[PDB]
Write a protein that binds this ligand. Structure first.
Ligand code: HEM
Ligand SMILES: CC(C)NC[C@H](O)COc1cccc2ccccc12
Ligand SMILES: CC(C)NC[C@H](O)COc1cccc2ccccc12
Ligand SMILES: CC(C)NC[C@H](O)COc1cccc2ccccc12
Ligand SMILES: CC(C)NC[C@H](O)COc1cccc2ccccc12
Ligand SMILES: *[C@@H]1O[C@H](CO)[C@@H](O)[C@H](O)[C@H]1NC(C)=O
Ligand SMILES: *[C@@H]1O[C@H](CO)[C@@H](O)[C@H](O)[C@H]1NC(C)=O
Ligand SMILES: *[C@@H]1O[C@H](CO)[C@@H](O)[C@H](O)[C@H]1NC(C)=O
Ligand SMILES: *[C@@H]1O[C@H](CO)[C@@H](O)[C@H](O)[C@H]1NC(C)=O
Ligand SMILES: *[C@@H]1O[C@H](CO)[C@@H](O)[C@H](O)[C@H]1NC(C)=O
Ligand SMILES: [Cl-]
Ligand SMILES: [Mg+2]
Length: 325
């Protein structure tokens, strides 16, 4: 389907409403590394089994949380291209599942959002690095560290100052312990943006003060559950305030090189000075390497989804065409 447009009415409103109650997981229901999508599934803004189309995802993030359209489009089509089934138009928000349909050939994985190194990556706030065995479940120890950082830098609330400190702490901990730590290109970007989302989108929209309380934080991060009477944000947004997070502890993109404490800067990575390069590498390298020589129907699906992806790219970038036009 065509990507949905922006909300006709983007006011704050009750989103934990009669039509969208929280329900617990049934056997087979899939949740993954994204507390936003998890919460939308657990309130029925998405299918409750956690398998959805790109259009369903875009509508859900807008309706349920007031995620802005451009961000919704870029994130959703990026995820779908690398983790979803392009023929069936289905993406798992978590683990790989037969519910997304017949798989394409190797080397494409169609691994859902749980697939490490495509969208999901290291130094997540409340999820462990894939190297440590589980990149998707809520981790209590990591959440308690988020609480501790909120106590120390946020007066007990999570805000952009807390985000700046916690983002850096998680990077440093991965450098110290994960010999395979990777922090380049798309993950370098998303790792920063995601730390703003709890302050911008999990804060009740009647307040919109950037100060997330720990009861609400746990509700979203652990239980995929909106607080009782939760109002979404009062305008469309995504990653505003990311500048505060970066400014706290500016980092270069890089990786450990097969040992702990060996963080080595990658001069071929994009960074915040080269946003168009991030897009170009995502398409030319990441997507292309999953689908190096697609058959006719896959090529058509790839090109359609790549056109949609480009709608979410910041103005000023040039579209690239890995499979021609
Ligand atoms: C628009 C479609 C979206 C997709 C496909 C998506 C997918 C993902 C994925 C795969 C991750 C894993 C990144 C990591 O390794 O840490 C992630 C991180 C995250 N996403 Fe989303 N996301 C979307 C939008 C949203 C929205 C709307 C919210 C909030 C309303 C949100 C909140 C988060 C948070 C908080 C994290 C980091 C969680 C943590 O580090 O513990 N995302 N997202
Ligand atoms: C169904 C689900 C939302 N139940 C919520 C729990 O009964 C209450 O949750 C909680 C409430 C208060 C503190 C906590 C600390 C750790 C883990 C959970 C906590
Ligand atoms: C509302 C609009 C200005 N948002 C786009 C800006 O680049 C801010 O958002 C973002 C900034 C930086 C990284 C991110 C990663 C994923 C999603 C959004 C991100
Ligand atoms: C630090 C701040 C000023 N910059 C934020 C970044 O420029 C956000 O960039 C981006 C964030 C998310 C997706 C994208 C897709 C294409 C191009 C740029 C994207
Ligand atoms: C790897 C890359 C060069 N190939 C992508 C495209 O297959 C390039 O060739 C093609 C270009 C245009 C239309 C086509 C239709 C079916 C199969 C191939 C087509
Ligand atoms: C937009 O929605 C809000 C909240 O539901 C409502 O109060 C407002 O009147 C709506 N505006 C229009 C133009 O319908
Ligand atoms: C290790 O890093 C490589 C390349 O950076 C990646 O392909 C692989 O999935 C990573 N594995 C884990 C468990 O981190
Ligand atoms: C949670 O994260 C901690 C700290 O990184 C780690 O030691 C632990 O194994 C993780 N998993 C669980 C299930 O607690
Ligand atoms: C975070 O909270 C602390 C304590 O209230 C405050 O000093 C800091 O200015 C806050 N930061 C933001 C970005 O709101
Ligand atoms: C991506 O490929 C296009 C050709 O399709 C090329 O013009 C562009 O320079 C490439 N960009 C990168 C970063 O490789
Ligand atoms: Cl919007
Ligand atoms: Mg992760």
């Amino acid at each position: 389907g065509l990507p949905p447009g922006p909300l006709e009415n983007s006011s704050a409103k009750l989103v934990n409403d009669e039509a969208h109650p929280w329900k617990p997981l049934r056997p087979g229901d899939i949740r993954g590394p994204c507390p936003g999508l998890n919460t939308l599934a657990s309130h029925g803004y998405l299918p409750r089994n956690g398998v959805a189309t790109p259009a369903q995802i875009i509508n859900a993030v807008q309706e349920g949380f007031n995620f802005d359209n451009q961000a919704a489009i870029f994130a959703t089509y990026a995820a779908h291209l690398v983790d979803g089934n392009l023929i069936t138009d289905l993406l798992s928000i978590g683990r790989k599942t037969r519910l997304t349909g017949p798989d394409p050939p190797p080397p494409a994985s169609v691994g859902g959002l749980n697939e490490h190194g495509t969208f999901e990556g290291d130094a997540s706030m409340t999820r462990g690095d894939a190297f440590f065995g589980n990149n998707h479940d809520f981790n209590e120890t990591l959440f308690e560290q988020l609480v501790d950082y909120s106590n120390r830098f946020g007066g007990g609330k999570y805000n952009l100052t807390v985000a700046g400190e916690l983002r850096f702490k998680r990077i440093q901990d991965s450098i110290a312990t994960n010999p395979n730590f990777s922090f380049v290109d798309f993950r370098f970007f998303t790792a920063y943006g995601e730390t703003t989302f709890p302050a911008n989108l999990f804060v009740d929209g009647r307040r919109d003060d950037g100060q997330l309380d720990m009861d609400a934080a746990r509700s979203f991060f652990q239980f995929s559950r909106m607080p009782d009477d939760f109002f979404r944000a009062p305008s469309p947004r995504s990653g505003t305030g990311v500048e505060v997070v970066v400014q706290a502890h500016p980092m270069q993109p890089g990786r450990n090189v097969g040992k702990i404490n060996s963080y080595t800067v990658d001069p071929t990575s994009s960074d915040f000075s080269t946003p168009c390069l991030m897009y170009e590498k995502f398409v030319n390298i990441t997507v292309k390497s999953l689908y190096p020589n697609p058959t006719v129907q896959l090529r058509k699906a790839l090109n359609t989804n790549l056109d949609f992806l480009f709608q979410g790219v910041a103005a000023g970038c040039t579209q690239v065409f890995p499979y021609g036009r």
